[PDB]
Design a protein around this ligand. Structure first.
Ligand code: SF4
Lengths: 1016, 1019
């Protein structure tokens, strides 16, 4: 037959682009290189001066937006620091460490709950916060080459997933029923203006239990600037609606078309109507004007930011206003005056209206720009021109329209004073002029309505910076109107701050006092009501998470703090009789090398050569008595160890039982014998020894006890069965895996002890051994149905915990995840498990995998345009293909503009459980039904790989894996770098396994009878 | 006794900043927050308009510089793409995929070798290449939120490590001896100008074997613009010297003080002197001038970039010149005219000279700036002011000094053209003016020296863009002088391109032809001569790396390509007799979840439920015959499997032997007949069955055979011993670990097969099982000294491979590392192992760990200034503390400027092996001496953790780990966020294990005797 070990022509051809080591240096002329470079170009071209058409294009342009794949990577990178500087730098004091930890553990619900607990507008802020000047500006990772964490994008992602869950906010469960609430909580409360400040203030007051809260809004739309001015391409209106509805879930009422103004609503009319407190959150309603613009109209081409931005918003935000308004017709050159946030949004928004060119003109220099670099970047990347040191002097109008603006030179002299040079002028041609000089409060009727509160020299309501209280005790203020806040988050914080003192004030008015220490409630939803208790071997666990017998339980004081944090149970470090006292060596605990040279958070494993507790049995027994006395509902299991001696095991187990331990855990690590009988050296490796030890203990104590099994055995089931036959009430699976973590290049080990640099085999723990522990738990669960199992081995999240429950375990022990972090992870594990169970009752979310929404086609986490004009056209996101995609998208936007139509956000409506929420007992062992022998697997129902071209990032890893580890079934296009799976695919699934994009490749049922390649 | 389970006051205090979940929302006023924010500030403050003192400060300001920690992370992130677009976008076509792969595997030598093979100025380019407009601009990862790879910084890092190794370049090993070289290679070759272009050209010609190469340089210094103008704070002079010395290692001669000029060296004098070929690489020697600056002197305050930058370079670059040069005195406001690379370097350099303020003024708009964004960013972050649309008209001079510059306004019209508005002027005050209008070749004497070559309409030497040849056959040109190159890398490529055709031309002149296909040699060093062959069980392996019996050996055609790539040996996929033919299911191979939701490169493991080969024994046996016929020196081992039947094992083993296999590997995964004793179910789990199977095969064949052991046993040594007693020539340790990779939230498994979404236990492979495999190999090696062991289990680099060799294995099998990449990793493994062995002979590098230099105090990978006024001040790199550090550093720079000196430049000298380079046989089992029982470990020689404040990034992880997983022995300062290990430390070593900064924490011998905490006195 032909040469079997040679590729035929067809395969040789398919392997054309497969990596091969070159034996010589390559030769390619500089000219050839210049001509080839443009074909692969991904990023902006420095030599390109035009901005892709953006007319009527309101797609998200934020650089911080993240998809799940990207969010998980960034969340894992976060160091999750103690006393985190990022949190200290966040105006609402968000517990960034905790919410990012939750995201890293795939607990998006927990992350969102943490975010909204401190910031009711968590999604809006995640999208618009100028992080470089806030939280991110203080991030410790700024001290690394890779840089600071994208905190805003992470916050946005978790909040977006929560929004998708369609779960409502609920009243505080710890609160008395509505009818049992003191009279004071029915006090009529009024807030003016429905912006971030009032929304936040009303939200917190509602959390506190106040039942009569009304926000009076002047306009017909709600959300304040988030709605009327911030562009849709930075902050989607549906986000604002989402946060407003969450607030309304608490009973807050909003009345539009009502203004704080003389002859309308005034502080006097409110007081007269019985309102007990009022919060002023009307912001700065008017534009800062300039004499040189007097009399100019929109028809001539002049707008203040207050005129222009709301026009664009009303036209691009479906759901904002009830009308359908065409977009402002901005043609020609546009001059935007100013250098604050507003100026840049006017510049980018002008492009959406059709502007041919946009000039951002400021009276100072580049160094003096007010907006954060990230905001400036957006206008810069869209090719807006920047003209520094120019002050407006005259606007030229001809034929009823603006045609130019004359400026004068500005300059800083020595003394630092900014001066204008009359003799140095600039005549700039322009068709449209937009002033972005800021906003103010001027309306005499509005100010009069605030009588008689004191106004400062800035002509703004004066308030105490700590209480947000005005000169009138019952009146408070916050947000832009106070003149301190520069952001949405600070305005939110102003309302938050004010809510506590408004509460204090109202309570006092009803003769009631409040805690000296501020106690604003957290954010709650129905998920928090989910019961995650479980019963095992006659013991009641408040939650299935506990500390394994290990470093985290080195001292009983640590267990106390763990219980205080919320852990369901805990194991004492293994202890023994005085005669068996041990002494540890050092170093003894090292990081795993199981996932490469990655240091810091999330070590994939640890290796330890630590012995049992160095503390005495007397210490542990007295400690157990104390712990059980102070934490009666938290389970305490005493871990004990003796040599193979009946009297010892009986003596120690009885001492532990007498201390008040809920149960005992038998550590079977003690040696015995020679070592060739095929059953190792430890007692736990010999069924006969295990059976006898359990018999001795069963005979000595009445409380339940579990045998902790080692995975270092041929058949762990035989050991489990022996423990059961001996009388054990269950087994703990499993202890550490024996191993050697590695050696340095010189051959010395790590850990290395003493001058001799010696070491001994240690135990591997962590996620790296989870596959071993998961197998152990499932095999035991299948062989001994109903026999209690306490799982241990790489549990580091609610998700992984649920995997073990599904595999047959009743409770979950943790060590490494805590060594990688701290005791507070229990908060993440509990909210995470509640969410996973809750979601199982929601019919409309069945397509999700736990808390992960079904993956949708995207690029950089942003949804791919499903335009018929782009589908199947094989247009990669680079070079000339990218240009084509941009042209097609632009044309689509123009078409959407011609056919003015749409507005159905189909009002937000919460999903309701359509079945009982599963209890832990309902999920235990549910995965066992899928496990079996290889013979039970169908070899008829085969699959093949299918690639989603739209999600591909053209790396060719699928191609390389199939070539050198598969069946050479993928074609990799030499021009587009797009892969195509051919009919020779066998469905091995390696390509999907190495793809960097989650769900880009999927395995689907084969459409033709499969035929094994026999080579023959 | 007191409450034992409660922390006493002092511990409660130490735990003050320990994480605790809050039960209520926090309350902090907006004002309080505004006041607290400045204390923790890390990045630049947007409201800061002032320029931090940079006078005489030439510290590295590149944002791309990487330290080992950072380089490893970035290298692992790289997708190591096929037909990589980054490489296509690199002017010198560097194999970025390969060099980055080597860095991720800790093989810095291999990475540097790959880099220098295609770019002789690899270090300079790593530091100065405008990557956003080159390699990085085409990076596939740009399509991800985290963004493109820092290719330049990675190149810089690998090259810097190689530079530190002090290893010389050597002549091409496959070249005939110097004496046996054809006469043509002695042809006298001349190159004009010692810049990137000529250095590259001379280097490649030298690689080809030419022995008489001379570069004539006009100045007294070498390196061209890299030396004379690129700032020391972007490109250290020692980098240039390094690359020059590497070139000189090949025999290239450099003569300074010699100019290509009519009254000196000309093409005619060279031809007359017998030179056979000449390369013109003199760049653009003169500044582009403007009539408005006529007559202005430096004393008045005027400089062209050609006057200014060299002055700064000569004073800041130790070694450049023989005389110490003063730093130009630039005081007051400085105006830099232009928007190209030069303008920005003039602006930043002006600040080092003491400028109070710097204005970058250009005649076009911001969008029209020529320099890449990264270059612009440096001037921007240093507070340089930018003034667009201004064209210079007059330099106002009063009192013999420039006091201002008058400009006119500019603008683009309705067609794109640019105009100047006379009526719109600007009068800008300034004390110094620096024109950065570019450079040109104008000297008539230099042009005349190039007669009679043709010049184009641009007034530059004309050359064929493919051959770099001028109108005169024996004269070539490249670099800036040609006018196409815009970068160092392109100039380097011009010289590279030219070397091949210069070679072709010279050979032809001597009546010899050259290959139609270009064959420039790679870069070589003594490391490449290191022997990594090894003998085991009577078999000779050219190198210890081979493909394990697995997916990568699914087909014999794949093994062929693997051998073509360089793999030492390979196992066939396990095959059997026709009656035992199997049929796979799908899906069957999935990624590991052992290191979290990290997708793409470097999966920490894989799980498979694949069976043995679906191809017949006939296919495999014929394939083995073919492979051994075509690759006699590559070892082929046939993996076979039968049920527990004597006749079957004897039949199959004989069939495999008859095919010509060098040896056999027995797969012991076949089940037995009913159990009876936690003896698993597979033959490989029962010593008795293993012994019998090996006995049957031993009686059947004469070639060596190895038993592949499963790690899924209580005592693997008992199985290894059984195989030995049975007659096996060795054992393969080990096969995959039994496991379940995971379940989806709905409880279904992955892999999930069929409509029933079923699965079965699979085998875990990859780095996640390496600890298990390493234990297996070491225990067998200790129990059966000298018994051959073939290692398998997480081997993915030369470094990890050496760990197994040290543990007792002779050869190394690989599977997962290839599944994660491709066959070309063998190149990294071989150069990596050669480097590791070579370095063991270098006495001056004993403090290194393999290829890793000892870690020094760094922040962001940049050396921490060892200033007396900083060490021990407890000044973290943030908030007010950072301000103080900067003030101290600035004062130090001023003192160095005043406490003058700096003639100590070194005499670059290669390290020479001071002992024989170890062979593989010399390292095997060397680690065993350190392994023993727990009782053999000293409990007297204890250690404690010690933290290097200067390397700390204030995360508090050490603190949190000791608090909830240790002994509450670390104090974490509430103001500086600096940790301090106290005397209660027990040396458990957890803090060091979780610290994100490599070597920030170190374990040191306890200075006080250790007393175990018993909690309660022992009675
Ligand atoms: S499932 Fe396997 S045979 Fe199919 S295209 Fe992916 S690596 Fe290749």
């Amino acid at each position: 037959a032909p040469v079997l070990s040679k590729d035929v022509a067809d395969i040789e051809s398919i392997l054309a682009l497969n990596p091969r080591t070159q034996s010589h240096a390559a030769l390619h002329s500089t000219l050839a290189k210049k001509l080839d470079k443009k074909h692969w170009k991904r990023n902006p071209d420095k030599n390109c001066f035009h901005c892709e058409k953006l007319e009527n294009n309101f797609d998200d342009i934020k650089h911080t937006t993240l998809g799940e794949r990207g969010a998980l990577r960034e969340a894992m990178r976060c160091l999750k620091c103690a006393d985190a500087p990022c949190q200290k730098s966040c105006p609402t004091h968000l517990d960034i460490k905790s919410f990012i930890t939750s995201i890293s553990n795939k607990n998006y619900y927990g992350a969102a709950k943490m975010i909204f607990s401190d910031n009711p507008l968590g999604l809006t802020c995640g999208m618009v916060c100028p992080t470089s000047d806030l939280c991110v500006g203080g991030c410790n990772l700024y001290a690394t080459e890779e840089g600071s964490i994208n905190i805003g994008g992470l916050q946005q992602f978790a909040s977006e997933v929560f929004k998708a869950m369609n779960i409502p906010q609920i009243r505080n469960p710890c609160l008395p029923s509505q009818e049992k609430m003191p009279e004071a909580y029915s006090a009529k409360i009024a807030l003016l203006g429905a912006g971030p400040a009032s929304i936040s203030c009303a939200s917190f007051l509602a959390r506190l239990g106040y039942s009569d809260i009304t926000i009076f809004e002047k306009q017909e739309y709600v959300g304040g600037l988030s709605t009327s001015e911030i562009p849709q391409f930075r902050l989607p209106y549906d986000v604002v609606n989402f946060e407003i509805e969450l607030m309304k879930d608490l009973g807050v009422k909003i009345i539009c078309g009502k203004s704080l103004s003389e002859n309308e609503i005034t502080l006097n009319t409110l007081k007269e109507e019985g309102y007990k407190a009022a919060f002023i959150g009307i912001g700065l309603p008017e534009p800062k004007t300039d004499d040189i613009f007097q009399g100019l109209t929109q028809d001539q081409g002049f707008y203040t930011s207050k005129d222009f931005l709301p026009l664009v918003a009303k036209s691009s935000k479906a759901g904002m206003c009830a009308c359908h308004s065409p977009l402002p017709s901005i043609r020609g050159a546009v001059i935007v005056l100013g250098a604050g946030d507003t100026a840049f949004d006017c510049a980018t928004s002008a492009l959406r209206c059709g502007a041919r060119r946009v000039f951002l003109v400021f009276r100072k220099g580049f160094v003096n720009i007010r907006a954060v670099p990230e905001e400036v970047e957006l206008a810069k990347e869209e090719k807006c021109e920047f003209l520094p040191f120019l002050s407006p002097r005259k606007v030229i109008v001809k034929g009823g329209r603006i045609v130019a603006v004359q400026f004068v030179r500005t300059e800083q002299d020595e003394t630092g004073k900014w001066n204008e040079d009359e003799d140095q002028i600039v005549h700039l041609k322009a068709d449209v002029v937009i002033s972005a000089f800021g906003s103010v409060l001027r309306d005499p009727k509005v100010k009069e309505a605030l009588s008689p509160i004191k106004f400062n020299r800035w002509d703004l309501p004066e308030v105490d910076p700590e209480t947000m209280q005005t000169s009138e005790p019952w009146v408070f203020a916050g947000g832009d109107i106070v003149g301190m806040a520069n952001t949405t988050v600070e305005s939110v914080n102003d309302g938050k701050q004010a809510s506590w003192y408004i509460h204090k004030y109202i309570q006092a008015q009803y003769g009631a006092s409040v805690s000296a220490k501020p106690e604003l409630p957290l954010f709650y939803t129905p998920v928090d009501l989910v019961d995650i208790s479980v019963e095992m071997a006659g013991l009641k666990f408040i939650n299935p998470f506990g500390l394994a017998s290990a470093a985290p339980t080195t001292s009983s004081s640590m267990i106390r703090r763990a219980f205080e944090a919320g852990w369901g149970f805990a194991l004492t470090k293994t202890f023994s009789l005085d005669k068996d006292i041990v002494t540890n060596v050092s170093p003894r605990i090292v990081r795993g090398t199981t996932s490469g040279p990655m240091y810091g958070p999330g070590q994939s494993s640890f290796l330890n050569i630590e012995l049992i507790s160095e503390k005495t049995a007397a210490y542990w027994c007295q400690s157990v008595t104390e712990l059980k006395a102070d934490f009666p509902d938290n389970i305490v299991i005493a871990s004990i160890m003796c040599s193979y001696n009946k009297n010892d095991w009986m003596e120690l187990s009885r001492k532990a039982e007498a201390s008040g331990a809920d149960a005992l855990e038998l550590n079977l690590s003690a040696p015995h014998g020679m070592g060739e009988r095929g059953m190792g050296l430890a007692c736990g490796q010999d069924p006969e020894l295990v059976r006898n030890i359990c018999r001795w203990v069963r005979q000595a104590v009445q409380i339940p006890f579990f045998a902790k099994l080692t995975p270092n055995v041929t058949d762990i089931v035989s050991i489990a069965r022996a423990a059961k036959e001996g009388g054990a009430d269950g087994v703990t699976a499993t202890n550490t895996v024996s191993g050697l973590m590695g050696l340095k290049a010189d051959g010395t080990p790590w850990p290395a002890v003493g001058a001799g640099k010696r070491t001994t085999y240690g135990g591997v723990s962590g996620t790296a051994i989870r596959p071993i522990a998961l197998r152990a738990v499932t095999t035991i669960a299948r062989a001994l149905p109903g026999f209690p199992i306490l799982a241990t081995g790489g549990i580091d999240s609610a998700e992984s915990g649920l995997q073990f429950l599904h595999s047959g375990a009743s409770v979950l022990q943790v060590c490494s995840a805590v060594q990688n972090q701290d005791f507070t992870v229990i908060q993440d594990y509990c909210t995470g498990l509640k969410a996973l169970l809750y979601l199982k009752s929601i019919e409309e979310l069945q397509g999700w995998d736990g808390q992960s929404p079904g993956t949708e086609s995207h690029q950089k986490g942003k949804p791919v345009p499903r335009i018929a004009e782009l589908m199947g056209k094989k247009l990669p996101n680079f070079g000339p293909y990218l240009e084509q995609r941009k042209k097609i998208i632009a044309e689509e936007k123009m078409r959407l503009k011609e056919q003015n139509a749409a507005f159905p956000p189909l009002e937000r409506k919460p999903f309701i459980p359509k079945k009982p929420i599963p209890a832990i007992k309902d999920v235990i062992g549910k995965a066992l039904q899928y496990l079996g022998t290889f013979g039970e697997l169908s070899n008829i129902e085969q699959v093949v790989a299918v690639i989603d071209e739209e999600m591909c990032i053209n790396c060719g890893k699928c191609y390389m894996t199939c070539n050198d580890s598969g069946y050479q079934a993928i074609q990799f296009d030499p021009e587009t770098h797009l892969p195509t799976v051919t009919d020779t695919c066998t469905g091995c699934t390696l390509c999907l396994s190495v793809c960097p994009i989650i769900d880009c490749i999927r395995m689907v049922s084969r459409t033709t009878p499969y035929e094994p390649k026999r080579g023959l």
